[PDB]
Design an enzyme around this catalytic site. Structure first.
Site, short mmCIF file in Angstrom:
data_model
loop_
_atom_site.label_atom_id
_atom_site.label_comp_id
_atom_site.label_asym_id
_atom_site.label_seq_id
_atom_site.Cartn_x
_atom_site.Cartn_y
_atom_site.Cartn_z
CG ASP A 238 21.46 47.53 34.15
OD1 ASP A 238 21.19 46.30 34.23
OD2 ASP A 238 20.65 48.37 33.70
CB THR A 239 23.79 47.80 39.96
OG1 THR A 239 25.03 48.48 39.71
CG2 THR A 239 23.92 46.31 39.68
CG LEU A 345 35.70 44.56 44.14
CD1 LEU A 345 36.65 44.46 42.94
CD2 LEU A 345 36.48 44.61 45.46
C1 HEM Z 1 23.20 49.61 43.86
C2 HEM Z 1 24.41 49.38 43.35
C3 HEM Z 1 25.06 47.99 43.18
C4 HEM Z 1 24.59 46.76 43.40
C5 HEM Z 1 23.20 46.32 43.91
C6 HEM Z 1 25.64 45.83 43.05
C7 HEM Z 1 25.58 44.45 43.12
C8 HEM Z 1 26.66 43.62 42.86
C9 HEM Z 1 26.67 42.18 43.04
C10 HEM Z 1 25.47 41.35 43.55
C11 HEM Z 1 27.87 41.72 42.69
C12 HEM Z 1 28.31 40.23 42.75
C13 HEM Z 1 27.78 39.44 41.56
C14 HEM Z 1 28.06 37.95 41.71
O1 HEM Z 1 28.52 37.50 42.78
O2 HEM Z 1 27.80 37.16 40.77
C15 HEM Z 1 28.66 42.86 42.28
C16 HEM Z 1 29.97 42.80 41.84
C17 HEM Z 1 30.78 43.82 41.39
N1 HEM Z 1 30.47 45.16 41.40
FE1 HEM Z 1 28.60 45.88 42.06
N2 HEM Z 1 26.74 46.55 42.63
C18 HEM Z 1 26.42 47.88 42.69
C19 HEM Z 1 27.24 48.95 42.38
C20 HEM Z 1 28.52 48.91 41.87
C21 HEM Z 1 29.33 50.06 41.51
C22 HEM Z 1 28.93 51.54 41.66
C23 HEM Z 1 30.49 49.61 41.04
C24 HEM Z 1 31.65 50.52 40.55
C25 HEM Z 1 32.24 50.23 39.38
C26 HEM Z 1 30.46 48.16 41.09
C27 HEM Z 1 31.46 47.29 40.72
C28 HEM Z 1 31.49 45.93 40.88
C29 HEM Z 1 32.59 45.06 40.51
C30 HEM Z 1 33.96 45.46 39.91
C31 HEM Z 1 32.12 43.65 40.85
C32 HEM Z 1 32.91 42.33 40.65
C33 HEM Z 1 33.44 41.78 41.97
C34 HEM Z 1 34.11 40.44 41.72
O3 HEM Z 1 33.70 39.69 40.78
O4 HEM Z 1 35.06 40.12 42.46
N3 HEM Z 1 29.25 47.77 41.62
N4 HEM Z 1 27.91 44.01 42.41
#
Ligand code: HEM
Ligand SMILES: [Cl-]
Length: 401
Positions: A238-239, A345
Protein backbone atom coordinates in the site's frame (compact mmCIF):
# COMPACT_ATOMS: atom_id res chain seq x y z
CA UNK A 1 -20.04 11.51 13.86
CA UNK A 2 -18.49 13.69 16.54
CA UNK A 3 -17.73 11.90 19.80
CA UNK A 4 -18.55 13.95 22.91
CA UNK A 5 -15.50 15.89 24.15
CA UNK A 6 -13.82 14.19 27.14
CA UNK A 7 -13.80 16.51 30.20
CA UNK A 8 -9.96 16.57 30.44
CA UNK A 9 -9.68 18.12 26.94
CA UNK A 10 -9.94 21.92 26.82
CA UNK A 11 -12.27 23.34 24.19
CA UNK A 12 -9.65 25.71 22.82
CA UNK A 13 -7.69 22.69 21.57
CA UNK A 14 -10.55 21.19 19.57
CA UNK A 15 -10.19 20.99 15.77
CA UNK A 16 -12.46 18.45 14.12
CA UNK A 17 -10.08 17.14 11.43
CA UNK A 18 -11.25 13.87 9.83
CA UNK A 19 -8.21 11.84 8.75
CA UNK A 20 -10.43 9.75 6.45
CA UNK A 21 -12.25 12.74 4.92
CA UNK A 22 -10.30 16.01 5.21
CA UNK A 23 -12.28 18.96 3.88
CA UNK A 24 -9.61 20.24 1.49
CA UNK A 25 -9.09 16.87 -0.23
CA UNK A 26 -9.78 18.15 -3.76
CA UNK A 27 -6.69 20.38 -3.41
CA UNK A 28 -4.47 17.27 -2.94
CA UNK A 29 -3.97 15.11 0.17
CA UNK A 30 -0.79 16.71 1.54
CA UNK A 31 -2.35 20.17 1.04
CA UNK A 32 -5.49 18.96 2.84
CA UNK A 33 -3.49 17.75 5.83
CA UNK A 34 -1.33 20.91 5.92
CA UNK A 35 -4.38 22.87 7.14
CA UNK A 36 -3.34 21.41 10.52
CA UNK A 37 -0.24 23.61 10.27
CA UNK A 38 -1.97 26.94 9.73
CA UNK A 39 -0.92 29.48 12.36
CA UNK A 40 -4.23 29.47 14.30
CA UNK A 41 -3.79 25.72 14.93
CA UNK A 42 -1.94 24.63 18.11
CA UNK A 43 0.99 22.13 17.98
CA UNK A 44 -1.35 19.58 19.58
CA UNK A 45 -5.12 19.45 18.97
CA UNK A 46 -8.04 17.14 19.76
CA UNK A 47 -10.41 16.09 17.03
CA UNK A 48 -13.84 14.66 17.88
CA UNK A 49 -13.82 12.66 14.60
CA UNK A 50 -13.16 8.93 14.46
CA UNK A 51 -13.91 8.25 18.14
CA UNK A 52 -11.93 11.28 19.34
CA UNK A 53 -8.12 11.51 19.48
CA UNK A 54 -5.17 13.89 19.76
CA UNK A 55 -3.19 15.01 16.69
CA UNK A 56 0.39 16.31 16.87
CA UNK A 57 0.64 18.83 14.02
CA UNK A 58 4.34 19.78 13.94
CA UNK A 59 7.56 17.85 13.29
CA UNK A 60 9.05 18.48 16.74
CA UNK A 61 6.16 16.90 18.70
CA UNK A 62 5.67 14.08 16.16
CA UNK A 63 9.38 13.15 16.49
CA UNK A 64 9.33 13.51 20.30
CA UNK A 65 6.25 11.30 20.67
CA UNK A 66 7.61 8.58 18.34
CA UNK A 67 10.83 8.57 20.40
CA UNK A 68 8.97 8.22 23.70
CA UNK A 69 7.46 4.72 23.46
CA UNK A 70 7.27 4.52 27.25
CA UNK A 71 4.46 7.11 27.17
CA UNK A 72 3.26 6.61 23.56
CA UNK A 73 2.66 2.87 23.03
CA UNK A 74 2.34 0.99 19.74
CA UNK A 75 -0.13 -1.46 21.29
CA UNK A 76 -2.91 0.51 19.52
CA UNK A 77 -1.36 2.15 16.45
CA UNK A 78 -4.49 2.87 14.36
CA UNK A 79 -7.31 5.39 14.75
CA UNK A 80 -10.04 4.47 15.46
CA UNK A 81 -9.32 1.88 18.18
CA UNK A 82 -11.32 -0.86 16.37
CA UNK A 83 -4.79 -6.37 13.15
CA UNK A 84 -2.17 -8.71 14.62
CA UNK A 85 0.87 -8.02 12.37
CA UNK A 86 4.30 -8.14 14.00
CA UNK A 87 6.24 -6.05 15.01
CA UNK A 88 3.80 -3.13 14.34
CA UNK A 89 1.94 -3.40 17.62
CA UNK A 90 4.89 -4.23 19.90
CA UNK A 91 6.97 -1.91 22.08
CA UNK A 92 10.56 -2.57 23.14
CA UNK A 93 11.81 -4.85 24.57
CA UNK A 94 9.53 -7.48 22.91
CA UNK A 95 9.70 -5.62 19.56
CA UNK A 96 13.50 -5.73 19.11
CA UNK A 97 13.73 -9.52 18.62
CA UNK A 98 11.13 -9.62 15.83
CA UNK A 99 12.51 -6.45 14.26
CA UNK A 100 16.02 -7.98 14.13
CA UNK A 101 14.61 -11.03 12.34
CA UNK A 102 12.62 -9.04 9.75
CA UNK A 103 15.72 -6.93 9.11
CA UNK A 104 17.46 -10.12 7.91
CA UNK A 105 14.98 -10.30 5.04
CA UNK A 106 14.75 -6.66 3.82
CA UNK A 107 17.95 -5.09 5.22
CA UNK A 108 20.49 -3.13 3.13
CA UNK A 109 22.53 -6.27 2.20
CA UNK A 110 19.46 -8.00 0.76
CA UNK A 111 18.56 -4.83 -1.18
CA UNK A 112 22.08 -4.64 -2.59
CA UNK A 113 21.72 -8.30 -3.63
CA UNK A 114 18.32 -7.87 -5.37
CA UNK A 115 19.14 -4.48 -6.93
CA UNK A 116 19.36 -5.65 -10.56
CA UNK A 117 16.50 -8.11 -10.18
CA UNK A 118 14.54 -5.05 -9.10
CA UNK A 119 15.68 -3.14 -12.18
CA UNK A 120 14.90 -6.08 -14.51
CA UNK A 121 11.37 -6.28 -13.09
CA UNK A 122 10.81 -2.52 -13.64
CA UNK A 123 12.19 -2.69 -17.19
CA UNK A 124 9.96 -5.66 -18.03
CA UNK A 125 6.82 -3.87 -16.76
CA UNK A 126 7.69 -0.58 -18.47
CA UNK A 127 8.68 -2.22 -21.75
CA UNK A 128 5.37 -4.09 -21.92
CA UNK A 129 3.52 -0.76 -21.41
CA UNK A 130 5.73 1.49 -23.59
CA UNK A 131 4.16 0.72 -27.04
CA UNK A 132 0.58 1.25 -25.77
CA UNK A 133 1.02 4.99 -25.31
CA UNK A 134 -1.11 4.74 -22.14
CA UNK A 135 -1.60 2.97 -18.84
CA UNK A 136 -3.54 2.91 -15.62
CA UNK A 137 -0.37 3.59 -13.66
CA UNK A 138 -1.58 2.44 -10.20
CA UNK A 139 -2.93 -0.83 -11.71
CA UNK A 140 -0.29 -1.43 -14.38
CA UNK A 141 2.93 -0.54 -12.62
CA UNK A 142 2.59 0.77 -9.06
CA UNK A 143 1.02 -2.46 -7.82
CA UNK A 144 2.60 -5.20 -10.00
CA UNK A 145 6.11 -3.85 -9.26
CA UNK A 146 6.18 -4.24 -5.39
CA UNK A 147 4.10 -7.43 -5.44
CA UNK A 148 6.52 -8.97 -7.95
CA UNK A 149 9.37 -7.82 -5.71
CA UNK A 150 7.68 -9.65 -2.80
CA UNK A 151 7.36 -12.88 -4.87
CA UNK A 152 11.09 -12.69 -5.57
CA UNK A 153 11.91 -11.90 -1.89
CA UNK A 154 9.66 -14.67 -0.58
CA UNK A 155 10.46 -17.31 -3.29
CA UNK A 156 6.84 -17.54 -4.43
CA UNK A 157 5.58 -18.61 -7.88
CA UNK A 158 4.26 -16.00 -10.34
CA UNK A 159 0.89 -17.87 -10.73
CA UNK A 160 0.04 -16.86 -7.16
CA UNK A 161 0.16 -13.11 -7.89
CA UNK A 162 -3.51 -12.55 -8.88
CA UNK A 163 -4.76 -14.37 -5.75
CA UNK A 164 -2.24 -12.60 -3.47
CA UNK A 165 -3.11 -9.18 -4.95
CA UNK A 166 -6.79 -9.95 -4.29
CA UNK A 167 -6.25 -10.89 -0.63
CA UNK A 168 -4.18 -7.75 0.01
CA UNK A 169 -6.83 -5.64 -1.73
CA UNK A 170 -9.44 -6.96 0.71
CA UNK A 171 -7.57 -5.12 3.47
CA UNK A 172 -7.66 -1.78 1.66
CA UNK A 173 -10.63 -2.08 -0.75
CA UNK A 174 -12.94 -4.93 0.37
CA UNK A 175 -15.41 -6.58 -2.03
CA UNK A 176 -17.96 -7.28 0.71
CA UNK A 177 -17.15 -10.99 0.44
CA UNK A 178 -15.71 -11.31 3.94
CA UNK A 179 -14.81 -9.34 7.07
CA UNK A 180 -11.34 -7.81 7.47
CA UNK A 181 -10.50 -10.65 9.91
CA UNK A 182 -11.41 -13.17 7.17
CA UNK A 183 -9.05 -11.52 4.66
CA UNK A 184 -6.29 -11.82 7.28
CA UNK A 185 -6.89 -15.55 7.87
CA UNK A 186 -7.15 -16.23 4.11
CA UNK A 187 -3.69 -14.68 3.80
CA UNK A 188 -2.45 -16.74 6.78
CA UNK A 189 -3.93 -19.91 5.25
CA UNK A 190 -1.92 -19.15 2.12
CA UNK A 191 1.24 -18.60 4.23
CA UNK A 192 1.21 -21.34 6.92
CA UNK A 193 1.95 -24.34 4.64
CA UNK A 194 4.79 -22.45 2.96
CA UNK A 195 6.27 -21.60 6.40
CA UNK A 196 5.91 -25.18 7.71
CA UNK A 197 7.57 -26.69 4.63
CA UNK A 198 10.53 -24.27 4.66
CA UNK A 199 11.21 -25.07 8.31
CA UNK A 200 12.10 -28.49 6.86
CA UNK A 201 13.69 -27.63 3.52
CA UNK A 202 14.83 -24.00 3.82
CA UNK A 203 15.64 -21.87 0.80
CA UNK A 204 17.44 -18.53 0.74
CA UNK A 205 14.02 -16.71 0.66
CA UNK A 206 12.31 -14.44 3.20
CA UNK A 207 9.78 -17.07 4.34
CA UNK A 208 12.59 -19.61 4.97
CA UNK A 209 14.56 -17.03 7.02
CA UNK A 210 11.57 -15.97 9.14
CA UNK A 211 10.46 -19.60 9.63
CA UNK A 212 13.87 -20.75 10.86
CA UNK A 213 14.22 -17.70 13.12
CA UNK A 214 14.77 -17.61 16.86
CA UNK A 215 13.12 -15.55 19.57
CA UNK A 216 13.46 -16.18 23.33
CA UNK A 217 16.12 -18.85 22.64
CA UNK A 218 13.50 -21.07 20.97
CA UNK A 219 12.25 -21.52 17.38
CA UNK A 220 9.70 -18.92 16.18
CA UNK A 221 6.06 -20.09 16.48
CA UNK A 222 3.93 -20.57 13.37
CA UNK A 223 1.60 -17.90 14.72
CA UNK A 224 4.51 -15.43 15.05
CA UNK A 225 5.99 -16.35 11.65
CA UNK A 226 2.64 -15.93 9.86
CA UNK A 227 1.98 -12.52 11.46
CA UNK A 228 5.51 -11.34 10.53
CA UNK A 229 5.35 -12.65 6.96
CA UNK A 230 1.98 -10.96 6.60
CA UNK A 231 3.51 -7.60 7.57
CA UNK A 232 6.39 -8.12 5.13
CA UNK A 233 3.80 -8.46 2.35
CA UNK A 234 1.27 -5.72 3.18
CA UNK A 235 3.98 -3.37 4.54
CA UNK A 236 5.66 -3.02 1.16
CA UNK A 237 2.47 -2.76 -0.88
CA UNK A 238 0.00 0.00 0.00
CA UNK A 239 2.78 2.51 0.91
CA UNK A 240 4.81 1.80 -2.22
CA UNK A 241 1.80 1.60 -4.59
CA UNK A 242 0.50 4.96 -3.39
CA UNK A 243 3.85 6.70 -3.02
CA UNK A 244 4.94 5.83 -6.58
CA UNK A 245 1.52 7.08 -7.71
CA UNK A 246 1.94 10.47 -5.98
CA UNK A 247 5.41 10.80 -7.45
CA UNK A 248 4.37 9.93 -11.01
CA UNK A 249 1.32 12.21 -10.75
CA UNK A 250 3.63 15.10 -9.86
CA UNK A 251 6.14 14.26 -12.62
CA UNK A 252 3.34 13.94 -15.17
CA UNK A 253 2.20 17.45 -14.21
CA UNK A 254 5.68 19.02 -14.10
CA UNK A 255 7.62 18.72 -17.37
CA UNK A 256 10.38 20.93 -15.92
CA UNK A 257 11.07 18.42 -13.12
CA UNK A 258 10.98 15.57 -15.63
CA UNK A 259 13.51 17.49 -17.73
CA UNK A 260 15.77 18.11 -14.74
CA UNK A 261 16.05 14.37 -13.99
CA UNK A 262 16.48 13.50 -17.67
CA UNK A 263 19.34 16.02 -18.03
CA UNK A 264 20.83 15.28 -14.61
CA UNK A 265 20.24 11.55 -13.78
CA UNK A 266 22.74 11.77 -10.87
CA UNK A 267 20.18 13.90 -9.01
CA UNK A 268 17.67 11.01 -9.00
CA UNK A 269 18.63 9.71 -5.51
CA UNK A 270 18.26 13.27 -4.11
CA UNK A 271 15.00 13.60 -6.10
CA UNK A 272 13.74 10.42 -4.45
CA UNK A 273 14.36 11.93 -0.98
CA UNK A 274 12.57 15.19 -1.85
CA UNK A 275 9.58 13.30 -3.29
CA UNK A 276 9.50 11.24 -0.06
CA UNK A 277 9.26 14.52 1.85
CA UNK A 278 6.71 16.26 -0.36
CA UNK A 279 4.46 13.27 -0.97
CA UNK A 280 4.75 11.68 2.46
CA UNK A 281 1.66 9.55 3.09
CA UNK A 282 1.53 7.60 6.40
CA UNK A 283 -0.34 8.73 9.51
CA UNK A 284 -0.08 6.19 12.32
CA UNK A 285 -0.74 6.71 15.97
CA UNK A 286 0.04 5.65 19.51
CA UNK A 287 -1.84 5.18 22.77
CA UNK A 288 -1.03 6.83 26.09
CA UNK A 289 0.33 4.37 28.67
CA UNK A 290 -0.37 6.78 31.55
CA UNK A 291 -1.44 10.31 32.45
CA UNK A 292 1.21 12.60 31.02
CA UNK A 293 1.64 16.34 30.59
CA UNK A 294 3.02 16.88 27.09
CA UNK A 295 3.99 20.40 26.01
CA UNK A 296 1.54 21.95 28.49
CA UNK A 297 -1.31 19.60 27.52
CA UNK A 298 -2.78 17.00 29.86
CA UNK A 299 -2.98 13.63 28.12
CA UNK A 300 -4.84 10.80 29.84
CA UNK A 301 -4.01 7.11 30.06
CA UNK A 302 -5.71 5.40 27.12
CA UNK A 303 -6.04 8.55 24.93
CA UNK A 304 -5.11 7.85 21.30
CA UNK A 305 -2.79 10.26 19.50
CA UNK A 306 -2.35 10.43 15.76
CA UNK A 307 1.28 11.25 14.89
CA UNK A 308 1.23 11.86 11.15
CA UNK A 309 4.58 10.80 9.62
CA UNK A 310 3.34 12.88 6.68
CA UNK A 311 3.35 16.21 8.51
CA UNK A 312 6.94 16.49 9.80
CA UNK A 313 8.44 17.11 6.32
CA UNK A 314 5.62 19.50 5.38
CA UNK A 315 6.20 21.62 8.52
CA UNK A 316 7.61 25.02 7.48
CA UNK A 317 9.70 24.82 10.68
CA UNK A 318 11.53 21.81 9.08
CA UNK A 319 11.75 22.80 5.41
CA UNK A 320 11.36 26.23 3.80
CA UNK A 321 8.54 26.59 1.25
CA UNK A 322 7.45 23.02 2.09
CA UNK A 323 4.91 22.71 -0.76
CA UNK A 324 7.67 23.57 -3.32
CA UNK A 325 9.41 20.54 -4.86
CA UNK A 326 13.17 21.23 -5.10
CA UNK A 327 15.46 18.32 -5.91
CA UNK A 328 18.53 20.28 -4.80
CA UNK A 329 17.41 21.04 -1.21
CA UNK A 330 20.57 21.06 0.91
CA UNK A 331 18.73 19.38 3.78
CA UNK A 332 15.60 17.31 3.21
CA UNK A 333 14.03 16.85 6.64
CA UNK A 334 11.19 14.29 7.02
CA UNK A 335 9.79 11.37 8.99
CA UNK A 336 8.31 9.67 5.91
CA UNK A 337 9.53 6.24 7.00
CA UNK A 338 8.68 7.04 10.62
CA UNK A 339 10.92 7.74 13.58
CA UNK A 340 11.97 5.85 16.71
CA UNK A 341 12.09 2.10 17.19
CA UNK A 342 9.53 1.26 14.47
CA UNK A 343 11.31 3.18 11.70
CA UNK A 344 10.50 1.43 8.39
CA UNK A 345 12.56 -1.72 7.95
CA UNK A 346 11.72 -1.48 4.22
CA UNK A 347 13.24 1.99 3.88
CA UNK A 348 16.24 0.87 1.85
CA UNK A 349 14.15 -1.41 -0.36
CA UNK A 350 11.60 1.41 -0.89
CA UNK A 351 14.30 3.95 -1.88
CA UNK A 352 15.72 1.47 -4.43
CA UNK A 353 12.23 0.77 -5.84
CA UNK A 354 11.67 4.54 -6.19
CA UNK A 355 15.08 5.30 -7.72
CA UNK A 356 14.86 2.33 -10.13
CA UNK A 357 11.31 3.41 -11.09
CA UNK A 358 12.35 7.01 -11.76
CA UNK A 359 15.45 5.99 -13.76
CA UNK A 360 13.82 3.31 -15.91
CA UNK A 361 10.62 5.25 -16.59
CA UNK A 362 12.37 8.51 -17.47
CA UNK A 363 14.78 6.60 -19.73
CA UNK A 364 12.13 4.74 -21.69
CA UNK A 365 9.17 7.15 -21.44
CA UNK A 366 10.71 10.62 -20.83
CA UNK A 367 7.62 12.55 -21.88
CA UNK A 368 4.27 11.59 -20.39
CA UNK A 369 1.22 13.43 -19.10
CA UNK A 370 -1.99 12.92 -17.20
CA UNK A 371 -4.72 11.68 -19.59
CA UNK A 372 -6.59 14.67 -21.17
CA UNK A 373 -9.74 15.52 -19.18
CA UNK A 374 -8.68 13.33 -16.23
CA UNK A 375 -8.94 14.82 -12.76
CA UNK A 376 -6.83 12.79 -10.33
CA UNK A 377 -8.79 11.73 -7.21
CA UNK A 378 -7.01 11.17 -3.90
CA UNK A 379 -7.93 9.31 -0.71
CA UNK A 380 -6.98 9.99 2.89
CA UNK A 381 -6.38 7.58 5.75
CA UNK A 382 -3.66 5.69 7.59
CA UNK A 383 -1.96 5.36 4.19
CA UNK A 384 -3.16 8.23 1.96
CA UNK A 385 -3.14 7.69 -1.78
CA UNK A 386 -4.20 8.02 -5.40
CA UNK A 387 -7.45 6.39 -6.56
CA UNK A 388 -6.25 6.11 -10.19
CA UNK A 389 -3.59 7.66 -12.40
CA UNK A 390 -4.29 7.54 -16.15
CA UNK A 391 -1.10 8.38 -18.05
CA UNK A 392 -0.51 8.90 -21.76
CA UNK A 393 2.52 9.28 -23.98
CA UNK A 394 3.56 9.25 -27.62
CA UNK A 395 5.38 5.93 -28.30
CA UNK A 396 7.41 7.68 -31.08
CA UNK A 397 9.14 9.72 -28.33
CA UNK A 398 10.04 6.67 -26.24
CA UNK A 399 12.94 4.20 -26.51
CA UNK A 400 13.54 0.52 -25.78
CA UNK A 401 16.94 -0.03 -24.07
C1 HEM B 1 7.29 4.43 0.23
C2 HEM B 1 7.42 3.30 0.91
C3 HEM B 1 7.24 3.14 2.44
C4 HEM B 1 6.85 4.02 3.38
C5 HEM B 1 6.47 5.52 3.22
C6 HEM B 1 6.85 3.33 4.65
C7 HEM B 1 6.51 3.86 5.88
C8 HEM B 1 6.61 3.16 7.06
C9 HEM B 1 6.38 3.72 8.38
C10 HEM B 1 5.99 5.18 8.67
C11 HEM B 1 6.57 2.75 9.29
C12 HEM B 1 6.45 2.93 10.83
C13 HEM B 1 4.99 2.92 11.28
C14 HEM B 1 4.86 3.27 12.76
O1 HEM B 1 5.85 3.66 13.40
O2 HEM B 1 3.74 3.18 13.32
C15 HEM B 1 6.94 1.55 8.57
C16 HEM B 1 7.21 0.33 9.15
C17 HEM B 1 7.52 -0.87 8.54
N1 HEM B 1 7.72 -1.06 7.19
FE1 HEM B 1 7.52 0.50 5.78
N2 HEM B 1 7.24 2.03 4.43
C18 HEM B 1 7.49 1.87 3.09
C19 HEM B 1 7.92 0.73 2.45
C20 HEM B 1 8.13 -0.51 2.99
C21 HEM B 1 8.54 -1.70 2.27
C22 HEM B 1 8.86 -1.79 0.76
C23 HEM B 1 8.62 -2.71 3.14
C24 HEM B 1 9.03 -4.15 2.77
C25 HEM B 1 8.29 -5.18 3.23
C26 HEM B 1 8.26 -2.19 4.45
C27 HEM B 1 8.23 -2.88 5.63
C28 HEM B 1 8.01 -2.38 6.89
C29 HEM B 1 8.03 -3.14 8.12
C30 HEM B 1 8.32 -4.65 8.30
C31 HEM B 1 7.70 -2.14 9.22
C32 HEM B 1 7.58 -2.43 10.75
C33 HEM B 1 8.78 -1.90 11.52
C34 HEM B 1 8.55 -2.13 13.00
O3 HEM B 1 7.37 -2.11 13.47
O4 HEM B 1 9.56 -2.32 13.72
N3 HEM B 1 7.98 -0.85 4.32
N4 HEM B 1 6.97 1.83 7.21
CL1 LIG C 1 -4.66 3.55 -12.27
Amino acid sequence: NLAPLPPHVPEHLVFDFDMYNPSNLSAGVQEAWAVLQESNVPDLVWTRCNGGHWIATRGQLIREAYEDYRHFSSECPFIPREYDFIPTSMDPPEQRQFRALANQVVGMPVVDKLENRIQELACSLIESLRPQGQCNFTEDYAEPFPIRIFMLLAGLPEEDIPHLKYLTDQMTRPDGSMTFAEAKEALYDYLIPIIEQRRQKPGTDAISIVANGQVNGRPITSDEAKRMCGLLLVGGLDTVVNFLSFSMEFLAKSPEHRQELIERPERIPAACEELLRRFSLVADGRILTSDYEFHGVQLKKGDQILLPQMLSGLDERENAAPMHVDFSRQKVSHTTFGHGSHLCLGQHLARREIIVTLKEWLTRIPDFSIAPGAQIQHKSGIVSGVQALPLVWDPATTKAV
